[PDB]
Amino acid sequence: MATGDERFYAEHLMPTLQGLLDPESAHRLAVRFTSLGLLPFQDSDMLEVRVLGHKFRNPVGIAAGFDKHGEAVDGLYKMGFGFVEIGSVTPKPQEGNPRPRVFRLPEDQAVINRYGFNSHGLSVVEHRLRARQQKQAKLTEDGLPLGVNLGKNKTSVDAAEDYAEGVRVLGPLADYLVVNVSSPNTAGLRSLQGKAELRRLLTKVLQERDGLRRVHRPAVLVKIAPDLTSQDKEDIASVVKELGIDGLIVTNTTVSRPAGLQGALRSETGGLSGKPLRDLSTQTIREMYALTQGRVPIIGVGGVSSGQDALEKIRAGASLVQLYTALTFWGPPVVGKVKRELEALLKEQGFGGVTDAIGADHRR
Numbered sequence: 001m002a003t004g005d006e007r008f009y010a011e012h013l014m015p016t017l018q019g020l021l022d023p024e025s026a027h028r029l030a031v032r033f034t035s036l037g038l039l040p041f042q043d044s045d046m047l048e049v050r051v052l053g054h055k056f057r058n059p060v061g062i063a064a065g066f067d068k069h070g071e072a073v074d075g076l077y078k079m080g081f082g083f084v085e086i087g088s089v090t091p092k093p094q095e096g097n098p099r100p101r102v103f104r105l106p107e108d109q110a111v112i113n114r115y116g117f118n119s120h121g122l123s124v125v126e127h128r129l130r131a132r133q134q135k136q137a138k139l140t141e142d143g144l145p146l147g148v149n150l151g152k153n154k155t156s157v158d159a160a161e162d163y164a165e166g167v168r169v170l171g172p173l174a175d176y177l178v179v180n181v182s183s184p185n186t187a188g189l190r191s192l193q194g195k196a197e198l199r200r201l202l203t204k205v206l207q208e209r210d211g212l213r214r215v216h217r218p219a220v221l222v223k224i225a226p227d228l229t230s231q232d233k234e235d236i237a238s239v240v241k242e243l244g245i246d247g248l249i250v251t252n253t254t255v256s257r258p259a260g261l262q263g264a265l266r267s268e269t270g271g272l273s274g275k276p277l278r279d280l281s282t283q284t285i286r287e288m289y290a291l292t293q294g295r296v297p298i299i300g301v302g303g304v305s306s307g308q309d310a311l312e313k314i315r316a317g318a319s320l321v322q323l324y325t326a327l328t329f330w331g332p333p334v335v336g337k338v339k340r341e342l343e344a345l346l347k348e349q350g351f352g353g354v355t356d357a358i359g360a361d362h363r364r
């Protein structure tokens with residue numbers, strides 16, 4: 001419990017917790033424990049990455065969705081994440097979908113969720129981040145940056161204005177912002193990934209970002225689905241290059257249900273995460289890196305539970321990776337495990353550090 005032993009968590013604690021609590025209760029309890037700093041690896045220099053205007057002490061971040069309301073940021077750095085992304089946050093508070101809305105597929109090492117952007121809203125999150133703003137400035141300066149992921153309200157009549165409000169309110173408190181246009185759980189949202197709509201939306205977002213004072217001006221990334229057509233991907237690449245978007249987060253959860261899922265809850269509605277998403281996400285990273293000529297930083301996400309999974313996404317083109325669903329199976333020790341395995345594999349494959357491996361599959 002205090003040592004952070006990989007076998008104890010994986011074989012005993014996590015399976016027992018999963019037997020006692022429904023998945024949303026487990027999520028809530030985990031946010032509480034983490035936020036209080038009740039948790040069970042010294043980052044080598046090889047793991048440092050400079051991208052998005054910042055130093056990252058290691059490339060393993062916590063993906064959006066775990067800490068939707070910015071309650072557990074310090075506890076997540078304490079767990080060993082090199083960067084934390086909170087959100088998605090919507091402009092006004094909203095409850096999200098009815099419960100149950102989160103489902104485990106233990107036989108598949110996967111989760112399906114349909115939270116529907118349950119959010120405390122911008123104002124609450126703004127005050128929560130303001131209460132630790134200078135502590136975060138020091139963390140960022142120390143190589144531990146903070147990302148804020150923005151969503152839109154269910155009943156909003158103007159999606160772009162929702163994201164612009166997010167830029168104005170939380171942009172000043174974030175090292176990077178994410179325009180989340182890839183939740184599967186908000187009606188109409190994924191259609192904003194289409195070319196004309198994306199160009200209009202991101203033009204407005206970047207104008208708002210550019211209007212912030214220079215020390216409060218974050219990088220802006222777009223988080224995309226794993227379910228895009230070839231046409232969709234080509235269009236996103238074109239718009240991102242045309243507008244000078246700072247990066248992409250690849251990928252959100254999938255609405256697909258890969259052949260072979262075994263969990264009893266495989267046909268629940270929602271986005272699927274974890275191991276069945278892993279290679280779909282990796283392949284989306286590979287395609288987006290190629291379409292952007294390796295000039296647009298990618299944060300790779302989807303099914304990472306080991307150093308090999310992280311390195312495959314880095315070699316496919318990610319400069320940084322994130323994970324969430326693996327934590328629900330393996331607990332806290334998985335963060336240090338990914339980092340230690342990633343360092344060992346980089347050495348084994350002749351890389352001087354993470355930076356050298358970024359996009360390495362495209363050069364062979």
Ligand SMILES: Cc1cc2nc3c(=O)[nH]c(=O)nc-3n(C[C@H](O)[C@H](O)[C@H](O)COP(=O)(O)O)c2cc1C
Pocket residue numbers: 063064065066068087088102111113115117149180223251252253272273274275277301302303304322323324325326
């Ligand atoms: C319970 C849950 C909630 C999520 N909520 C969000 C969210 O609010 N915003 C977002 O951009 N992604 C959200 N995601 C997606 C994750 O950030 C990540 O893209 C995806 O789960 C793939 O990573 P993983 O396989 O490591 O979980 C959520 C995922 C899960 C499992």
Ligand SMILES: C/C(O)=C(\C#N)C(=O)Nc1ccc(C(F)(F)F)cc1
Pocket residue numbers: 022023024026027028030034066102103104111327328329331332
């Ligand atoms: C949806 C979801 O978050 C869960 C389920 N099911 C869950 O177990 N969460 C969860 C469980 C444990 C941790 C930690 F590692 F930090 F201790 C983090 C998140």
Ligand SMILES: O=C(O)c1cc(=O)[nH]c(=O)[nH]1
Pocket residue numbers: 065088113114115116117118180182183184185252253271
């Ligand atoms: O709140 C949610 O349902 C949610 C948002 C998102 O971006 N991705 C996801 O899998 N769930």
